[PDB]
Symmetry: D2
Subunit: 283 residues, 4 copies
């Protein structure tokens, strides 16, 4: 039906690969080696708008990452293919990507990769628990999985300024997130710019529910959160990001005081059949 992008216990490590279609004529050999490996559990697949446009196919609901003319920076770095590796072994995830690069040889070239890890049981490097208000069980299926079993994922690589965020008094940190670090209690007196106040899923006229599967990351670029939002469409994520960016009321999310996204991508996660991944509407 769907890919296992909602599996309850999240593995300790993840690796997100992003490929650019450098040689579209050599695409058939790449798909012959990739598709038998896409089980939706240890290796998940996402199709970008450039890949659909290059093959002359239109995927309903698929479009590139939007362009927000706001006072904050939300870059659009749309790629052709997104590979999401999951597993408890960090080195195993590293060796699979090296094999995936060779198997995808001339058609697709690696444009970006993220060595992600689950901090604690699902906490940001700032210490705050993330995933408290994520839909669970069937309501996660209703909010993240479309009718045909497919999902629409948005990815953003947020870079944290941990030194500055920890320089603030604890009351300033809690007012930025909207939750108390000591006990994860929601602050009902937080300013409207608080992240929890900006992204309250029930505070939108169409309820902007979504399933978030974010993990932490750290390399030469710094450290932060690899944000992943899964939805039955992109409308949930996009209406949240527009309000965080101040495009609705003029109030900008407090996250931008210490963190900014480095990348931005929209990807269509194809449905699963009983005999593997179903990429038919494209293939």
């Amino acid at each position: 039906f769907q890919q296992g992008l909602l599996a309850t216990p999240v593995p300790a490590h993840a690796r997100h690969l992003f490929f650019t279609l450098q040689s579209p004529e050599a695409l058939p050999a790449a798909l012959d080696a990739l598709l038998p490996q896409v089980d939706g559990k240890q290796l998940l697949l996402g199709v970008g708008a450039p890949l659909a446009k290059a093959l002359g196919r239109e995927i309903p609901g698929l479009r590139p990452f939007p362009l927000l003319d706001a006072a904050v920076e939300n870059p659009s770095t749309q790629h052709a293919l997104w590979l999401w590796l999951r597993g408890d072994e960090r080195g195993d995830l590293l060796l699979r990507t090296q094999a995936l690069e060779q198997a995808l040889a001339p058609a697709l070239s690696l444009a970006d990769s993220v060595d992600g890890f689950l901090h604690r049981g699902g906490h940001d490097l700032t210490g705050y628990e993330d995933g408290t208000e994520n839909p669970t069980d069937e309501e996660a299926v209703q909010a993240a999985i479309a009718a045909d079993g497919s999902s629409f994922a948005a990815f953003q690589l947020w870079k944290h300024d941990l030194q500055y965020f920890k320089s603030l008094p604890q009351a300033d940190q809690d007012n930025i997130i909207g939750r108390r670090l000591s006990d994860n209690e929601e602050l009902d007196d937080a300013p409207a710019s608080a992240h929890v106040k900006r992204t309250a899923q029930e505070s939108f006229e169409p309820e902007a529910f979504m399933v978030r599967r974010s993990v932490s990351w750290a390399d030469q670029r710094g450290a932060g959160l690899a944000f992943v939002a899964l939805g039955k469409s992109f409308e949930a994520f996009e209406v949240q990001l527009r309000r965080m960016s101040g495009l609705e009321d003029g109030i900008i999310d407090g996250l931008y005081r210490f963190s900014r996204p480095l990348t931005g991508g929209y990807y269509w996660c194809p449905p699963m059949s009983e005999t593997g991944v179903d990429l038919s509407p494209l293939l």
Copy 2:
């Protein structure tokens, strides 16, 4: 009334700085230290759409880097401020950026920087001369400078695959560029995908003339061309990139066979007064 963006001898070195508005309340102290240094000759200034939106001001013609839903990737990495340092001394430009970072420290944080150099007298790292068909003297002023003396610049950091491009036969390299490497003579029988055929300035519905001030670059990200396009508006550059991306006729520029842009930005270069740079429209 314009910044010296057309100076006849291009200095041997350039340095392009891109800043993110991290703390908008501390902007006045940043502007007090920055504006006395903007002479338009050794330090040029460009205003991004995020900076205009944060101050609640609308500059006619200023908008973020566009989002092209094409089969090739032209990322949109719009920042708030662009500082363009020019000079013959590479170390002098480096020490000036360190002073500029410290002086703009809390309001603006450095998001990206490019150590550019003029290869030979104005050649791309592939060996082809770039700037052959650039307008000069008064025709350059009409194509790059608006009525109020301001200019609208588009920036792209292209990453070259020099090993692959030099692996091609010399006839294939000339057909990708559209010009003969041996004598810079235009190949009149090159395919429609040739770069010169894609960007023929006289072949556009309104003549899409522009002044290009590109330089080479090389660091840990690789090597390529720091593309800078100056126009009286963004319509010249944008109609060129849309045709290069196959959005007009379906034919994609041959440059994408060996090079792809890593960044994309639109910036408004304010006019010059007799008493320094004129930012009044935005104060």
Copy 3:
């Protein structure tokens, strides 16, 4: 009373920090904040030869990493202080280093750091199990712990060429290691250049036994093995490396066909008292 550097189950992640003594006048304040944190289990401490020289103290058995005039490269990158972080949470080790850098900010500066992880249950990224012939229980204490509670540690960051090593036939890989990858069986007819043949602990005039606590690593520098050898002295490690380098018989270890060390350091791990780590001899 030794530091817990021999605990049988190795945590999933490690972090090796290396500091240079930039400001000796601020050293006492740095030690006042650091030494209460050295428990020898989650945070272990190693003293380098430069630190002993700066305080005018001589530690018996402490000397810098040697200089091997061989046909292979074993660089000597001796630092003043070594901090060895252990834990199952990769992000916890990251946030600890940020706090350790700030607390040691003026006296000691971070010269190098390694984000290490235990691959599978203790395998190299090439797939071979490492630690098969490591002494255990009392034999580990006899080989790694001196008469006092102290130990002498050697550190090397080996960079692997996994693409080249995996390109070789499996029989060629096994002849380099000296063991069969399929079943970890020792090859009794492997060439003398095999690693196991070069480092056979029982083949030295005094038996050169040692406890190895190496982990894998991967960052912008590549990927490989963070080699850690603990001994009652440096004579065990040093006599192994000289034979691996061909300084004994002229035969060079097969490891240098696909791997090379990037760093090299000798560090004295002080004993533990009931009141924390015991730096008496150095005061």
Copy 4:
């Protein structure tokens, strides 16, 4: 009969390459393509001790970068081969290195590279002029060129903390260098830890003269000085570094307050013959 290691006008840019001998069996094919390109002016060659050790040859005066048991850190990062590219075009030097990697492909692999540039006319990024007391003309030949026309070069990649050093008062900066930044006047009352006082070439019982051809550098590792010291032997440089490290009198050079070396290498620059560079002592 020597490589153009003393040419008076230094080109605006340099690129120092360092190679590791990964596959000795493909070394003859690598040397066949490299040696005809070494003219000693735009491309200079330096032989490391591992390369001589791999060929079973002993070069008199060639040894790895030394091991200094001092209170400061001078790492020894000895490589097999050193290629020193010089030229006024930064991009030309980049394209020649990519071709050199392919020409040296399986035998030698690039271990480290430095994109160097001549700051101002010969100034450090701190602003101080470097090369003031460098020997010139024939006295440079006497100090840097051996009898057989060969030279022994020492290389160090120093990383500067410009933010910290420039935060200090100018009197503190001048006391570290031993010279006044405002007019390059030598401070005759500077502390013994001053760099000029530590490295005073006439203050050694055998005069430790050497020709320095350093350039600035800046990349992801930071910024500083790519230090290159040329001598008729390594004894000049080595006795200077021992004093800077406090191994002679216990006084450490003030440079270590804001800068530290990241690499260290000894390289033998072979003489030039009528038919190019002369590696005979290595290739009979």
